[PDB]
Amino acid sequence: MNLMLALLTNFTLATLLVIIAFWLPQLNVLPFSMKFFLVAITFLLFDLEIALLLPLPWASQTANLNTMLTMALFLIILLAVSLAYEWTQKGLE
Amino acid sequence: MFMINILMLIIPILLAVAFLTLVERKVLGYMQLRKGPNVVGPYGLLQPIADAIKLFIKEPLRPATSSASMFILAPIMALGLALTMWIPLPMPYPLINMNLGVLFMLAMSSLAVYSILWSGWASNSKYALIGALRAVAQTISYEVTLAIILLSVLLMSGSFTLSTLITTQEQMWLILPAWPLAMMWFISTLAETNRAPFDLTGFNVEYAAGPFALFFMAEYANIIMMNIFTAILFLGTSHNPHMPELYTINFTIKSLLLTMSFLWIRASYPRFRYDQLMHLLWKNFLPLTLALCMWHVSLPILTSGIPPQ
Amino acid sequence: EYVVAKLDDLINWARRSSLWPMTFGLACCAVEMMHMAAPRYDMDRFGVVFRASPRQSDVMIVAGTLTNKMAPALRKVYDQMPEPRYVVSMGSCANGGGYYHYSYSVVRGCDRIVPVDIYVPGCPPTAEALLYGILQLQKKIKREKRLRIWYR
Amino acid sequence: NLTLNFGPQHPAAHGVLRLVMELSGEMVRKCDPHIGLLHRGTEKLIEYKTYLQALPYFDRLDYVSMMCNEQAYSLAVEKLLNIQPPPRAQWIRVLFGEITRLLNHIMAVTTHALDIGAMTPFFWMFEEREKMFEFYERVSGARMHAAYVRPGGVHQDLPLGLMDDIYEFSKNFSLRIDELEEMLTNNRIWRNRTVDIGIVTAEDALNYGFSGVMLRGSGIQWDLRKTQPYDVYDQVEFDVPIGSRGDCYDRYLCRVEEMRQSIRIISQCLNKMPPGEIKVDDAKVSPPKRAEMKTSMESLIHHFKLYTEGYQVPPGATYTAIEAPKGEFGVYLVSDGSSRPYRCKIKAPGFAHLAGLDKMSKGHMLADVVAIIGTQDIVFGEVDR
Amino acid sequence: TYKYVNLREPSMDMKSVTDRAAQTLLWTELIRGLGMTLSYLFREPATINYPFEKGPLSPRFRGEHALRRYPSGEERCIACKLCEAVCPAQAITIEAEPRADGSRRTTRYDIDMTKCIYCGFCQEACPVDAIVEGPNFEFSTETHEELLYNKEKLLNNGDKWEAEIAANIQADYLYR
Amino acid sequence: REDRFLNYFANIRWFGGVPLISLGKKTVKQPVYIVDVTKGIINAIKDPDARGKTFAFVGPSRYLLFDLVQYVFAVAHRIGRLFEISPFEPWTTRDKVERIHTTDKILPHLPGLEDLGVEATPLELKAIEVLRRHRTYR
Amino acid sequence: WFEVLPGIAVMGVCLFIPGMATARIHRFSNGGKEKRVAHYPYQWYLMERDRRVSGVNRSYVSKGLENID
Ligand SMILES: CCCCCCCCCCCCCCCCCC(=O)OC[C@H](COP(=O)(O)OCCN)OC(=O)CCCCCCCCCCCCCCCCC
Ligand code: SF4
Ligand code: SF4
């Protein structure tokens, strides 16, 4: 039942030290850029389709395998075709 | 006495890296034909204990141009999760037997980019406003290069938990089937933790003597952690039930050599000039990662060698 | 008190054990300090680390010759230093401005702007008397913090 | 557009050269730097001094050259005074005049490789550089700044030694230049850090008035080292490097071969030195010896007067230039006819070599711009011309 | 003459590309070269322990000013003012006077150790060889008000040592 | 710039900003400006004849109001101590709090400042300088 | 080259503690026995049962063949 009593010591230790750091032992008495935006959108697209790629090692101790074989390879295809049309235009990146 | 196991892991790991800035320079010293700390030690070993006193004597002046609730908030989480990530890690016995923990390391390391976006933004102008952005923008690109090739060895090791990972490497040193992955493991982990070849890394220059030391102490905490994380994964050691001591003897001493590698690569190479730095990921790294992702699926199938779970 | 005054033989020892200097390379006295950084008279790890960000400094070093186009920029960096600071200027053109002294646009002294504590003489001080000036500076710290609030 | 002034920042390199950047988002396309951090009042100051007394203010004009400066001054004065220097003296001006090039071309690579950010080739070569300042102290007077070349030739003879020392020094140097060949040439990242950067090759690369490298290594074969003599300097054999295209990496590879020429010339110069005298004999310019200025009557009156005032220089303008190890070195020394000279205008490199940063920079990054500067090898205090 | 460096067309055949393909893909470069040239760590660190060890010099090295005198004390200076007229920083200032014995000596004698640019011409201008650049770099006081040397430093400073000075002149006066 | 009385105000970032003591009766005294203080000494240091004839320092125009405490939070928009901190350099809940709220505009027959001239400084122009809080622009 | 060897024997020894400490806690908390791990819910059901029938309230003690004879 200590998980939850496991990190509570860790976070009370960090917030303690700043009080001896920033507090009481001190006592002193945007322009837009398009090329720096599209990579964040591009990342989140490949961030989703690795979570659908994620349940693989439990998907091997299974039934008839060629269903799980030929379909799991298909997600990598859609992850790769998505590159190639986007590879036609990346910008100064 | 569960509580005394906690304090005998948090406190004895702070001295593990507080006495490393010494080792940082001496390894840097004996390449340049020069000696270590000479006057204070005598062997250097009395240097960082005095320097730790200075940063809490010297006055931490605060920016009048910033908020206060946000400015100390980023050092709160800096020791929070970057020390929490130590917890379900075996030596040979972890503090917590998590049923799945490899996802748990990535779940905590993904919030490391969520700290740098604080300190540059809530502080000030230009440098602290635009310069602190790009550093998130490089370190968002190194989870997809991290997590995919991570998944390609769970296909052969067997499951998510880390306790079975020792038994499945008792004869192997699993770099031998994954020496292409060994580069793209170590290169990508080097790049996330903000070190000398992969550096562009105003998110430090505003911190005075008080809270600069934290985001120098937490950053070092990461780097031995990516050493100890590669240690259990690639270069697995032998295990003895009747002799648990012999595990830890040849456990940290292997991670200590890879700890020197970050100090050793730093003494060779220049930077990468940011436009190339992401260009060498998508154009160059990522197509090989998908190919080897397809590789570790078909081959345990075309072996009838599926790992049991 | 013997109890309290024992403490400042650690703190006033600790500040003279870790100095993080700034250097202002302006003229030929900059080059000789680089040879002190070169590992013959290896400047690192005798108490003192190499270069450092402008925020985290204790001992600033003005080297070379000051012009009136640099007199504002010197004071602004001098404000941003924390409190237990010291100014040590090498070079004979930082003590009266060497010769160039009768010129129309050279700061006369590097003393009428900042208060400086240790004066090393010479066109280039030969990176041999300059470690001697630094060991003079750690010898200068015999001050006290206790028996200041304990007296008044 | 953001108008950051990344310069006064004491970010290693040389905390100076404060400029503006009107960057168009990420590319720069407009750069207008400011100079004048050290103006020092130099050219006005010499107008009150004499010829021998003004001489070290040529020495402190670089940071590096100690015998290549004052080489451009005595040779700019001896033409006015109808003097050839004696032949033993000319073999020393070529020896130290071909030893300062083994100080610029070490500093011109390491300090460029420090802005870039490499640590270890800065410490791996200055530790070998210490074996060379012992020469300067043994011969003239000090660590660096030596009032050693005079208008009357060499000051004094170099003592016993310095011939089994230089031959000892120069026989173990090509291994050290074979180190940096492994450090930078065959490497890819530093090659990838500098290829096709600063491609300036047209006739405006000469209409900007550039001197050498950031010349001939970009194309046009010309130099002041075998079309114009100095002293006994044509009687030695060497070749001059030429790179392929007009970028920085084909002006970098001049400097590796340039240091592979100065070793040949030193190993060629030592075989050819005759015994002889030091100074010019007619003693209206050279001071007489110390054992002479204590015996005869003629020695003191041509000693005691030769320090109250200086020489007697005829009028008429003059001009010359020599090979500074980063460029030409113009001196337009106006003479008036007394012990004190008139106007002394100097041309140093960097006037051309940094006004042409406007052409060279644009179309590129911001991180390119710091990598541009350490290729021209620009030193401030020397832009005080 | 000429030399055309970095001017070499590639091989472009079947086998020699495998030397350029193994280079990029498996990194036979950058480790055989750059991981071995760094280590190369086993050499001896050539560092001088400065408060204990000291480096080399030369017998003609410049430094602190001092004044000499004859056998039993005579003030070798004759105040012939020549060191003043060649000082580039005009750090010399001398007022002389006939002392009551009859021979002229000095009253004020100054070296602006701030202004002093160390051209050393004073050492090469005195006919009776009075002022000598003494080879000791011992310095670094704490005020600007102190380094202006009056006379009664310099005769004292010329008499903290003489055997240090008197041996260097006697080993070097034949050259000059 | 760095006195105690005017920096006693706006160093009161607290859970309540109370004046002394929730009353606008006696406030305020005569805040003479610091340039006038150092100018009075240097005129008197060779005046001559200024011995015995003691002098008084006039303040601004004229007495002052309660508005000063409201004037703080309006425009501010609401040295050998120790190595860590001094244990007692307090706000002193003692006779400190009354030594300023006792105004005593005293006898005008002292000469004492305008005759030792010339000292004439308002308050509204020098108030931008000493006050410094988080807005700093508007 | 010698002086770096005391540098290695400080931070590397500082990692020897928690692997030694934890293996001298769970071994000590169960009396020279390793801790019963539970990853699947069928595995926990043994500990949920056997603690109720061990002797009083413990999961690190056994009964043996001599319990019911
Ligand atoms: C058919 C059978 C099945 C298939 C088997 C085939 C096996 C193939 C195994 C391949 C896997 C490894 C290759 C992975 C890609 C490596 C990255 C790379 O090659 O990028 C090249 C990089 C980019 O530049 P480039 O494209 O070369 O253009 C310039 C041309 N002159 O240019 C470069 O060369 C620079 C190198 C990258 C820069 C970073 C270097 C930093 C130093 C890192 C040291 C790593 C040490 C070893 C790793 C640690 C061990 C854990
Ligand atoms: S005179 Fe001194 S301070 Fe000035 S440039 Fe020369 S060495 Fe540097
Ligand atoms: S050194 Fe010569 S000029 Fe100077 S005071 Fe002595 S005698 Fe006179």
Ligand code: SF4
């Ligand atoms: S030491 Fe130098 S500055 Fe001083 S008087 Fe002699 S020549 Fe002039």
